[PDB]
Amino acid sequence: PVSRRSFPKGFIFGTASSSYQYEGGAAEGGRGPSIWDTFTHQHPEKIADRSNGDVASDSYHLYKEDVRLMKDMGMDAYRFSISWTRILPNGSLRGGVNKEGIKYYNNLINELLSKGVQPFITLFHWDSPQALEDKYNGFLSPNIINDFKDYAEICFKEFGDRVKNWITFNEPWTFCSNGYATGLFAPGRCSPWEKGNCSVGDSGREPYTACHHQLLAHAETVRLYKAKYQALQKGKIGITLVSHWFVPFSRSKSNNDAAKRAIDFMFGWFMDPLIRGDYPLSMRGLVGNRLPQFTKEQSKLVKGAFDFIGLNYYTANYADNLPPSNGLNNSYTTDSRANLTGVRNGIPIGPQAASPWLYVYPQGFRDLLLYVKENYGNPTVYITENGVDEFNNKTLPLQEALKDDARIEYYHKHLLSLLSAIRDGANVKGYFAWSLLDNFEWSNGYTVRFGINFVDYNDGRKRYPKNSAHWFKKFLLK
Ligand SMILES: O=[N+]([O-])c1ccc(O[C@@H]2O[C@H](CO)[C@@H](O)[C@H](O)[C@H]2F)c([N+](=O)[O-])c1
Numbered sequence: 001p002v003s004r005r006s007f008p009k010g011f012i013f014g015t016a017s018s019s020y021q022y023e024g025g026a027a028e029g030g031r032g033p034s035i036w037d038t039f040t041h042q043h044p045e046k047i048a049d050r051s052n053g054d055v056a057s058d059s060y061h062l063y064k065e066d067v068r069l070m071k072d073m074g075m076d077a078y079r080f081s082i083s084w085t086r087i088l089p090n091g092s093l094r095g096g097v098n099k100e101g102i103k104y105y106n107n108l109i110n111e112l113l114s115k116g117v118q119p120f121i122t123l124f125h126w127d128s129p130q131a132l133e134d135k136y137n138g139f140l141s142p143n144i145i146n147d148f149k150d151y152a153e154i155c156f157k158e159f160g161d162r163v164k165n166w167i168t169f170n171e172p173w174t175f176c177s178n179g180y181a182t183g184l185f186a187p188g189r190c191s192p193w194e195k196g197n198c199s200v201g202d203s204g205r206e207p208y209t210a211c212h213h214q215l216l217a218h219a220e221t222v223r224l225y226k227a228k229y230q231a232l233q234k235g236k237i238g239i240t241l242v243s244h245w246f247v248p249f250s251r252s253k254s255n256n257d258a259a260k261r262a263i264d265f266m267f268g269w270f271m272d273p274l275i276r277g278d279y280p281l282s283m284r285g286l287v288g289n290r291l292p293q294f295t296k297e298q299s300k301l302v303k304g305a306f307d308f309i310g311l312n313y314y315t316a317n318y319a320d321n322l323p324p325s326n327g328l329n330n331s332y333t334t335d336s337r338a339n340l341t342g343v344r345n346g347i348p349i350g351p352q353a354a355s356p357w358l359y360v361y362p363q364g365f366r367d368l369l370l371y372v373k374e375n376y377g378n379p380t381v382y383i384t385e386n387g388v389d390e391f392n393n394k395t396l397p398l399q400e401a402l403k404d405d406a407r408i409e410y411y412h413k414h415l416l417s418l419l420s421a422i423r424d425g426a427n428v429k430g431y432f433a434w435s436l437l438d439n440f441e442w443s444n445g446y447t448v449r450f451g452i453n454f455v456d457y458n459d460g461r462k463r464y465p466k467n468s469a470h471w472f473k474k475f476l477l478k
């Protein structure tokens, strides 16, 4: 018990959102379709409630209320994402620049600043242009790099006078693993035997190609930022990565080496190229010629290409050793030879949230942060996402739905765990809660609510503060 005053001076507290999950106005103000527009409309069976982001939380119209809601809590900063196809309706410069899209984000930024809230902007939060998907399969083509670079530069030119904090990509792990290994997220590609039962793809090659291309697009974009923009705009640029914490299934050395392989595959996949200039050893060994290779020039470009690392933490998994399968079912999912579970001998690692993958384990938050400290030279970190969900329940009266004690408990323990890690030397500068509002939770649609504020989808998307909102107001005092 635990308040802002417990944290170092200058420490930043905020909330996070993303364009597709919040904005709505999908076909409004000249916005082009993204792969998630396509994905939700053509494959509604892949969304738990067959829903889409057409309206979402209507932030495109209601963003002033959002800023008001953050301000009432005393938030320092807002993490949001720009929709690529709101700026470049068909992905590329030559396809035309959408003026009305630029106006919207200017309005959002100006509104935030008029109320003392600093904007942290994610360039890519999965809403990849459909036109570039159709043209060359999006991130499976090296052509994506320049189109991304051109998109990024328009953001630097239009917004960089006021925006001082930039994130290139959000959770490339999630994007690549779910989009191309399991095919459960857009663009919904995978091997036929894999979970998404996709019509096209290869779970053993495509995840790696996609993410390789994201890393190159990231590095190119950082380089560009530092070369042309950083001198006069004096902002910072980084990237947001997820990691679970991995507890060895038992005390055996092989289970310990599995947990190490799990983290190498989920997290080191991006961290090692960024810190050491190449993919993890276990990745190059186990994946072989299915993993692309950096040229010497590419390695130089990727190494050290960041001002900070955004870190997302939600849960822990047990990690157990797995024999090679051995043969013709190569998938990124199994490539690690680590079997991931949240339950061990019928005992869940922590209480299970509404998301079936989300188990409450505050300990691992600290563990992850210290792992980063000890193994990656303690880089500047912001916690770009942390949070939990409850079910969307149409039978509960409104006032019962606002009582999110489980969320308060989640934040209480995780903030304590974050504090202890900081006190033990973790180079952490800020913290963003996922998320400000209930929103479109991807393949879970609206069946699940992550918000500190309730959104009534059946009453014009009206916002209501949950109990946790009040809790954060207290916490954020002075
Ligand atoms: O399945 N996963 O391993 C996994 C990881 C991060 C995930 O999601 C992350 O955190 C939030 C809550 O989940 C999302 O709304 C964010 O947009 C995303 F960054 C998701 N996901 O959104 O479905 C899934």
Ligand SMILES: [Zn+2]
Binding pocket: 058, 061, 062
């Ligand atoms: Zn509206």
